[PDB]
Amino acid sequence: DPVEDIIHRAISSATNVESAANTTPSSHRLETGRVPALQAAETGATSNATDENMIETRCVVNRNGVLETTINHFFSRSGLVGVVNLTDGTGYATWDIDIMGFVQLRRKCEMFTYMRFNAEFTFVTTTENGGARPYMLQYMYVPPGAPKPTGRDAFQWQTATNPSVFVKLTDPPAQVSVPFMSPASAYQWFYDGYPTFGQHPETSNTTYGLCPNNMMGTFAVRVVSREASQLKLQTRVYMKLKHVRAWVPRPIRSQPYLLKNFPNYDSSKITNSARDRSSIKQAN
């Protein structure tokens, strides 16, 4: 009775798969019209020709494990993400928490665009000659907006609101757990965009690709003492990705790395993906 036109699913299906797939026995095909070997790669789909329809196979009850290949068992292996150098005699050292600076764990994380995980940090602090001297350290976590410490014995080390860890050099290394601290719903490693409005330049726009949903703060460290002790330190920070979910896979890096935040490469030296051989007509 009123205006009528105001009144007016998916494809994939997940299966719990425990072991690898089996193989059923086959026979020989002598008939026309039914062909499993001819494909069309232009349709954007991969080939679906199974090996029972190409050759004659046997019955194999397959008992291999598909457990270690999941994204939880692949990323729950802690690797180095930052090295903080402290020379005492300004007395302290800070570290902007950015794990895109070391290349063993970066390339594993660049397989995907969006990742949602918890972390588990570990701080292995030594001296420059090996370590083990009984001095006491303090590790603050400074969130974005909190005042960073400006002295060896400044008042920001009172630490009444934000977390901190007291541990000696001669103890086992300190280890905490860190939740999902981003304001978005996933850490994105590739942000094709600009953070602010305005006229963006042509020569050197250092803001392209800056994602402020990933900047998580500052990690500060000092030696808990009054008089300046004279000993050079290094901490090493190891991040273990746990409870991890990943979205939108992308190809893996093939060019050698350059800057932390920007995916630069040089165009004058492009390394080939496959190392060369003599000719195409021989295999070795």
Partner: protein
Amino acid sequence: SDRVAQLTVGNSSITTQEAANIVLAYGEWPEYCPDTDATAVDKPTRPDVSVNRFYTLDSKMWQENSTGWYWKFPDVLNKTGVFGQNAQFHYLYRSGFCLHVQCNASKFHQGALLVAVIPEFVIAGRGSNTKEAPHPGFTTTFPGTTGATFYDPYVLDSGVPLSQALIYPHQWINLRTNNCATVIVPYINAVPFDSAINHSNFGLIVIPVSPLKYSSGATTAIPITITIAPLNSEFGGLRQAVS
């Protein structure tokens, strides 16, 4: 019954007689934002006819020595039509797309294109500096309707090889088999709504892998046209115009 198709969206329709198939990106359809995932507290606008229709861009001539091309979405439609006016008055934005790349050639021509869709496609600079450092200009990152030619298509201008770029949603335009590629893409972002001016979600890319070859006497001018269309688009946060 598979090579013939028609795609009617809005007041526009595309026919084809030599198609291959239609690809849904990641097996999902573009839809509106549900109430369990929305974070704004205003009511969105949904024009649903005036902004969901096939917009035809310009044509790119394909030659012997073409190194390839890339657009940013929704960058190319911020200045065309009523979608270009709703994406300037409104701060927030959400949509899907439906892409269609037409390229015909005769029975005596040969070659192949790779039409893929890359979410969050970040352009790299081309210098051997370790900090200053070179960064791409604004007309290179956000090119507009005229696109941009690749410098190094082997690494997709991002240090990432083309040989593995079939993990993205894609089709092929093989000139002996088809003449058109169709990819339907949902909304892929870490936030439910995001700005349509700062942030372009994905980038369409057409790269000729095997080059165009033709014997003498054939038609030398082979153009590539691209016709795109928003689907299930909705806006929010009304204000004055910012381009």
